[PDB]
Design a protein around this motif. Structure first.
Motif, PDB file in Angstrom:
ATOM      1  N   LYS A 114     -29.146 -17.265-104.046  1.00  0.00           N
ATOM      2  CA  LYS A 114     -28.735 -17.068-105.436  1.00  0.00           C
ATOM      3  C   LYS A 114     -27.237 -17.250-105.709  1.00  0.00           C
ATOM      4  N   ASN A 115     -26.397 -16.667-104.860  1.00  0.00           N
ATOM      5  CA  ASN A 115     -24.952 -16.775-105.027  1.00  0.00           C
ATOM      6  C   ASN A 115     -24.299 -17.532-103.881  1.00  0.00           C
TER       7      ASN A 115
ATOM      8  N   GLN B  26     -22.193 -19.723-103.965  1.00  0.00           N
ATOM      9  CA  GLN B  26     -20.801 -20.038-104.209  1.00  0.00           C
ATOM     10  C   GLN B  26     -19.856 -19.075-103.501  1.00  0.00           C
ATOM     11  N   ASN B  27     -20.380 -17.935-103.060  1.00  0.00           N
ATOM     12  CA  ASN B  27     -19.535 -16.985-102.354  1.00  0.00           C
ATOM     13  C   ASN B  27     -19.309 -17.397-100.902  1.00  0.00           C
TER      14      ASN B  27
ATOM     15  N   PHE C 243     -16.340 -20.386-101.638  1.00  0.00           N
ATOM     16  CA  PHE C 243     -15.013 -19.806-101.739  1.00  0.00           C
ATOM     17  C   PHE C 243     -14.351 -19.650-100.359  1.00  0.00           C
TER      18      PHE C 243
ATOM     19  N   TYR D 169     -12.525  -9.805 -99.299  1.00  0.00           N
ATOM     20  CA  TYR D 169     -11.897  -8.654 -99.927  1.00  0.00           C
ATOM     21  C   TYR D 169     -12.825  -7.542-100.403  1.00  0.00           C
ATOM     22  N   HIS D 170     -13.988  -7.903-100.906  1.00  0.00           N
ATOM     23  CA  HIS D 170     -14.918  -6.893-101.366  1.00  0.00           C
ATOM     24  C   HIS D 170     -15.437  -6.133-100.155  1.00  0.00           C
TER      25      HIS D 170
ATOM     26  N   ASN E 194     -19.196 -24.776-106.063  1.00  0.00           N
ATOM     27  CA  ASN E 194     -19.269 -23.528-106.798  1.00  0.00           C
ATOM     28  C   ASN E 194     -20.648 -23.587-107.454  1.00  0.00           C
TER      29      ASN E 194
ATOM     30  N   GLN F 123     -20.194 -11.734 -98.020  1.00  0.00           N
ATOM     31  CA  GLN F 123     -19.276 -12.480 -97.179  1.00  0.00           C
ATOM     32  C   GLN F 123     -19.080 -11.716 -95.869  1.00  0.00           C
TER      33      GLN F 123
ATOM     34  N   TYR G 191     -17.250  -8.544-107.853  1.00  0.00           N
ATOM     35  CA  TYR G 191     -17.038  -7.269-107.164  1.00  0.00           C
ATOM     36  C   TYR G 191     -15.655  -7.268-106.523  1.00  0.00           C
ATOM     37  N   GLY G 192     -14.986  -8.415-106.538  1.00  0.00           N
ATOM     38  CA  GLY G 192     -13.668  -8.493-105.934  1.00  0.00           C
ATOM     39  C   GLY G 192     -13.194  -9.905-105.659  1.00  0.00           C
ATOM     40  N   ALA G 193     -11.916 -10.030-105.319  1.00  0.00           N
ATOM     41  CA  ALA G 193     -11.322 -11.328-105.044  1.00  0.00           C
ATOM     42  C   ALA G 193     -12.157 -12.154-104.077  1.00  0.00           C
ATOM     43  N   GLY G 194     -12.169 -13.464-104.302  1.00  0.00           N
ATOM     44  CA  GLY G 194     -12.903 -14.373-103.441  1.00  0.00           C
ATOM     45  C   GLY G 194     -14.406 -14.393-103.621  1.00  0.00           C
ATOM     46  N   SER G 195     -14.901 -13.773-104.684  1.00  0.00           N
ATOM     47  CA  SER G 195     -16.333 -13.749-104.905  1.00  0.00           C
ATOM     48  C   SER G 195     -16.652 -13.552-106.369  1.00  0.00           C
ATOM     49  N   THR G 196     -17.812 -14.054-106.782  1.00  0.00           N
ATOM     50  CA  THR G 196     -18.283 -13.924-108.159  1.00  0.00           C
ATOM     51  C   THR G 196     -19.777 -13.716-108.046  1.00  0.00           C
ATOM     52  N   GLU G 197     -20.390 -13.176-109.085  1.00  0.00           N
ATOM     53  CA  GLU G 197     -21.820 -12.941-109.050  1.00  0.00           C
ATOM     54  C   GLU G 197     -22.436 -13.441-110.352  1.00  0.00           C
ATOM     55  N   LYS G 198     -23.650 -13.963-110.265  1.00  0.00           N
ATOM     56  CA  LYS G 198     -24.346 -14.464-111.440  1.00  0.00           C
ATOM     57  C   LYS G 198     -24.810 -13.326-112.328  1.00  0.00           C
TER      58      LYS G 198
ATOM     59  N   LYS H 222     -19.550 -21.518-114.741  1.00  0.00           N
ATOM     60  CA  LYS H 222     -19.094 -21.320-113.373  1.00  0.00           C
ATOM     61  C   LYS H 222     -18.022 -20.234-113.489  1.00  0.00           C
TER      62      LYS H 222
END
Lengths: 221, 236
Positions: A16-17, A19-20, A23, A84-85, A162, A194, B48-55, B63
């Motif tokens: 699903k994600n 793109q993570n 990055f 980072y998370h 992405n 990650q 949730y934080g730098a270097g990541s994004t969530e749908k 995007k």
């Protein structure tokens, strides 16, 4: 690490994600020359007082307590993929990055001229691509090489974007001189983070840059 | 604090648009939403934080990017009319629930086939009706801006140089009056005694956000750039 079967590989279309992951390999890695631990949280990790665009402290979880205290005082070189998370370095203070492995002794591990390693990519059972990877370490971590491999494939072959990927499955195979070979799945499980994904680098596996080979296996959607 | 840029944007279909969010709350979570007249506030992407994004819930066509703790971007690779909307950004601490969130000022984004319809407004001021200006005791000024497009305008009242919010009665939102023409109005009420004083100064300030430098306009005609028009008037 005996080779993988088609059913053993992760399908990108099932993430699903994804793109993570992008990055991580699309951006710059965290690299540091000749530095020494400064603190520590768990027994198997080392904390460094290094900085980068998004951090003033770096934490690197190593294979085990043994390896941790092994590099504790030495002057190491750092090369890794940070996240980072969920990066708990302390209780309060933050602005810290986290990685797994990526550590090697700095003294006497550099080369006069960088060692180029050929990466042989095979797409759909047909090894049709070859490009070079470069390093100046005699003993380099698979992580460093893996990153360089993926950073190239992402920039030139759109290994990652992405969003979805043009490839369904993929992995990198490391073929050390007189040692058992191993590999890393290019894609994660449908649900991942990650930090959980990057554990492939925790054992701090190192390779002789002069006598190691790299093969990449991809299949298109 | 949470900021967004741009706050106004007119784009051409199939073009690339980038809305940017900057926060100073040092919150780990950042969000991107869109609001649509009648409909609700929907989540597109979040992090949730730098270097990541969530749908989020309506990720399609968008995007996201979280270069750092402070920044969260919403990228629109191929802009389309359906993406015309008001975008809202927000940072969030803890679990990132509404009570823990802080929103940006919002961004109006309008996507059109071409920018040749974009037009500044006509602003006019009106003196109080002779009727109310006797057995009314209260004088009411009316400011009307119309003929503008898209609906990226602000109307403010100024008396004697200082801004005024008391007595002002602006329309909630620009009412469309034709396919490519919006209309907005506002009233300012004062005491007849005040309105009759030659010393008092009434000013209706209207700002219309128009095309920018980045926006390419067909040479020859005057580029409908942002305007700051004002209709003023003295007592009696």
């Amino acid at each position: 690490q005996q080779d993988p079967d088609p059913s053993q590989l992760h399908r990108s279309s099932l993430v699903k994600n994804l793109q993570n992951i992008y990055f991580l390999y699309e951006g710059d890695p965290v690299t540091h020359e000749n530095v020494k631990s400064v603190d520590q949280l768990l027994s198997h990790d080392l904390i460094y007082n290094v900085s980068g665009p998004n951090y003033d402290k770096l934490k690197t979880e190593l294979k085990n307590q043994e390896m941790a205290t092994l590099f504790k005082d030495k002057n190491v070189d750092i090369y890794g993929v940070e996240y980072y998370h969920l990066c708990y370095l302390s209780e309060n203070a933050e602005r810290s990055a986290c990685i797994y492995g990526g550590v090697t002794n700095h003294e006497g591990n550099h080369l006069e001229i960088p060692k180029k390693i050929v990466v042989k990519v095979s797409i759909d059972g047909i090894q049709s691509l070859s490009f070079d990877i470069e390093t100046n370490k005699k003993m380099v971590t698979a992580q460093e090489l893996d990153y360089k491999v993926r950073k190239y494939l992402t920039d030139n072959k759109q290994l990652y974007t992405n969003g979805p990927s043009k490839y369904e499955t993929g992995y990198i195979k490391f073929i050390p001189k007189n040692k058992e070979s191993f590999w890393f799945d290019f894609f994660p499980e449908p649900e991942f983070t990650q930090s959980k994904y990057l554990m492939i680098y925790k054992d701090n596996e190192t390779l002789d840059s002069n006598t190691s080979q790299i093969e990449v296996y991809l299949t298109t959607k | 604090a949470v900021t967004q840029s741009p706050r106004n944007k007119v784009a051409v279909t199939g073009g690339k648009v980038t809305l940017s969010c900057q926060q100073t709350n040092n919150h780990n979570n950042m969000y991107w939403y869109r609001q649509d007249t009648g409909h609700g506030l929907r989540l597109i992407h979040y992090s949730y934080g730098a270097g990541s994004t969530e749908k989020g819930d309506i990720p399609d066509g968008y995007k996201a990017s979280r270069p750092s703790q402070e920044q969260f971007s919403l990228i629109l690779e191929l802009a389309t009319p359906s993406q015309t909307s008001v975008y809202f950004c927000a940072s969030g601490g803890g679990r990132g629930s509404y009570a823990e969130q802080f929103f940006g000022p919002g961004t109006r984004l309008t996507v059109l086939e071409d920018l040749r319809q974009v037009t500044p407004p006509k602003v006019s001021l009106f003196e109080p009706s002779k009727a109310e200006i006797a057995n009314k005791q209260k004088a009411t000024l009316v400011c009307l801006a119309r003929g503008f497009f898209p609906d990226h305008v602000e109307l403010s009242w100024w008396v004697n140089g200082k801004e005024v919010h008391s007595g002002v009665s602006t329309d909630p939102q620009a009412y469309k009056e034709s396919n490519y023409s919006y209309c907005l109005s506002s009233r300012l009420r004062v005491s007849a005694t005040f309105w009759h004083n030659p010393r008092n100064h009434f000013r209706c300030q209207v700002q219309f956000h128009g095309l920018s430098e980045e926006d390419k306009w067909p040479e020859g005609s005057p580029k409908p750039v942002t305007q700051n028009i004002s209709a003023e008037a003295w007592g009696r």
